[PDB]
Amino acid sequence: HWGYGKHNGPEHWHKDFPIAKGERQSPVDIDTHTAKYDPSLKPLSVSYDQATSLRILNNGHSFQVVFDDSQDKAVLKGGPLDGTYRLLQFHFHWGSLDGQGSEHTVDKKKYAAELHLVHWNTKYGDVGKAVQQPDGLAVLGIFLKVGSAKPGLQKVVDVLDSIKTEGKSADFTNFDPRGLLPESLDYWTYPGSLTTPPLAECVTWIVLKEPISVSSEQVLKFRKLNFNGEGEPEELMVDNWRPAQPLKNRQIKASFK
């Protein structure tokens, strides 16, 4: 039932998923002046050399690129994390225009889009078990601004015409997610949740300070995706972002001064 529209969007989700009003919901606004530099935080370790992408999929909340998570091939460690987190998939959230689309905001600034690389804690064995734990998932969030093209995104862009409508997938092997990362691994971190149903409070968020630049042509191709299935009335897949939620009793920590 849930989506991003007037009658099924974020303001409705709490009816099916009451944790939507919980104590550690995501996304949030990152107030840069309030976030505290924490010298005890470690550099983030992103080890994607052996990543094995499998498929690209439209699921009617985004498109995702899925990875083989049956071994420690593409793992996130260090930073605020204890233990090892396997990359399952990445996906994006984006807007109808360049002034909105991100889920996290920075001093209330919205970016054109936000990339999420979703990882789960190997100590829970599978992602379904991991979502039931407060330290089950680590999501690496990366902001997208519009300017110069991101060459490492183009392979993704070019297959989106083949997964237009909900239910469509394609082979998407040999994709290297290192090509989506900014130079700096400077980050903010806080305890939060999935930003889609089931909104489980299972995520350590790691949001990079440095955005990547993508071209207008690249983001335009995101906006040609459809929320609907083939044969149903066409609804452009745009504005698939949850707004910032109350910070409540949480501290956002910065890895950098």
Ligand SMILES: [N]S(=O)(=O)[C][C][C][C+2]1234B567B89%10B%11%12%13B85%14B%1158B%12%11%15B%139%12B%1061B%12%112[C+]5%153B%14874
């Ligand atoms: N925007 S987000 O918080 O990264 C949630 C992405 C969708 C998920 B949630 B957890 B399991 B549940 B299933 B898998 B895992 B995360 B990916 C899909 B959905």
Ligand SMILES: [Zn+2]
């Ligand atoms: Zn997401």
